[PDB]
Amino acid sequence: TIKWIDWVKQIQSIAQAGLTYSKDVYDIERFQQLRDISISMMSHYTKTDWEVVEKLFASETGYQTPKVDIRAVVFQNEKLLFVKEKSDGKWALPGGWADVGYTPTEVAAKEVFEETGYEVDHFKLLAIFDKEKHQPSPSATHVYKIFIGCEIIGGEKKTSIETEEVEFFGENELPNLSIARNTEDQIKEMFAYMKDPQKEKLID
Amino acid sequence: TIKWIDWVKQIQSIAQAGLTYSKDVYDIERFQQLRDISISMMSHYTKTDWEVVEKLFASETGYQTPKVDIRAVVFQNEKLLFVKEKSDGKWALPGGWADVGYTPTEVAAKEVFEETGYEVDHFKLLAIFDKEATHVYKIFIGCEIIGGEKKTSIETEEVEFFGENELPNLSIARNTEDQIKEMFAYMKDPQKEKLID
Ligand SMILES: O=C[C@H](O)[C@H](O)[C@H](O)CO
């Protein structure tokens, strides 16, 4: 693996904590210098514009925790609901970044409605995966993925600008997965839950 | 001209100054973390440059989400592990902010070890709460003592196990009275539906 990336992510994290919590004017200035070195290291070794890296890597406030992604797990006739993005042509469970000001089930409901047309409720906590644990490639960011089971209670299948196709798929007919949005192993775990819904919940 | 070497040397020299001159216990710990990382970095890549990773930011947008707090839920014969906090002198489950570089269960095991000296395993996902300027998803993770011993701290003045009717004064930001009640409900009925806000 690339060892340097996880070191630099930890330096930015501590610098971000220092800028939030230090009250010492010379320590605040040391934490700002350290964040700026972290941007410069990322900028040079990924050949990415310095100011772009600052926005993508080093503009959060407060203590730095992993980011939260939500995936909705909706079955019908033992087939799992997937949505295809028009631009990249790849498939994933409905979901996305958790919006500030929304609870996890509100994110699941809103993402399912916007991407698929369906109304959902009857939320179940299924799993929390650590995106980095067996990640294919190195990442600038650390993500926890919360999988929430839901029941379709209304609305109707509807495509959009972003969302070209909405379809259910059986476990021996999976479409081309967006590995960034969901791994094969995360999908296999959801079919294991469908077969035995009283099973232990996966937490990385 | 191998640029990582001068940047790591700068990080080291800043961290050493911070470590020498800070009077705040939390500032000292941050500078100690940075010193520790810089040592680890220098002890690698002897001759070579760092690998260029030109695709690292391809799908990155700088989107901000709720922060993650983790609370470890540790029972011993029907009593729940609490910790008296230096901040307010009130009591809470071991836990805190989830750190970059750690899985949820590594966070739970780490917070329990540093705050109480116990080593835990057998992790179970119990709940995620959020009652909606700071937005927080709080993950309750159950686990069991497999080793270590009870050790109080400069940070953690007392470590006590408490039953449902003898609860100490709770640090309410860290754990509400309803969140603790729910945890006792999981211990008593261990097939209760897991809560997710
Ligand atoms: O919240 C957790 C943090 O470690 C502490 O609040 C910081 O060290 C700031 O003092």
Numbering used by the authors:
A (entry chain A): 2 to 205
B (entry chain B): 2 to 133, 141 to 205
Show sentences the authors wrote.
B. cereus CDP-Chase is a member of the Nudix hydrolase superfamily, which are a family of enzymes that hydrolyze nucleoside diphosphates linked to some other moiety, x. It is a bifunctional enzyme that can hydrolyze CDP-choline with the typical nudix reaction in addition to a non-nudix exonuclease reaction on RNA. Although its endogenous substrate is CDP-choline, CDP-Chase can also hydrolyze other nudix substrates including ADP-ribose. Data for the B. cereus CDP-Choline Pyrophosphatase (CDP-Chase) crystals were collected on a larger, single crystal (60 × 30 × 20 µm) using vector collection, and the smaller crystals were used for a multicrystal approach for direct comparison (see Section 2.2.1). For the single crystal, the data were indexed, integrated, and scaled with FastDP to a resolution of 2.08 Å with 〈I/σ(I)〉 of 2.6. Cocrystals grown in the presence of ADP-ribose, a suboptimal substrate for CDP-Chase, do not show electron density for the complete substrate molecule or the expected product of hydrolysis, phosphoribose. Electron density observed in the active site was consistent with separate ribose and phosphate molecules. The ribose was bound directly by B-R31 and formed water-mediated interactions with B-W98 and A-Y22. When cocrystallized with ADP-ribose, loops A&B 86-91 and B159-164 become ordered, while the loop B133-142 becomes disordered. Overall, the ordering of previously disordered loops and the sizable changes in the conformations of other key catalytic loops suggests that these crystals have captured another catalytically relevant snapshot of CDP-Chase, most likely the active conformation.
The two recently opened beamlines for macromolecular crystallography at NSLS-II have launched the microcrystallography field into new territory, with flux densities up to two orders of magnitude brighter than those previously available. In this study, we highlight the capabilities of the AMX and FMX beamlines at NSLS-II by describing structure determination from single crystal vector data collection and two methods for multicrystal data collection. The advent of next generation synchrotron beamlines has necessitated the development of new strategies to fully benefit from the increased beam intensity and smaller beam sizes while minimizing radiation damage. The high dose rates, in conjunction with the newly developed ultrafast raster scanning goniometer brings formerly time-consuming serial crystallography measurements into the minutes range. These new opportunities mean that inhomogeneous large crystals can now deliver high quality data collected from their best volume, and crystals as small as 5 to 10 µm can deliver one or more complete datasets.
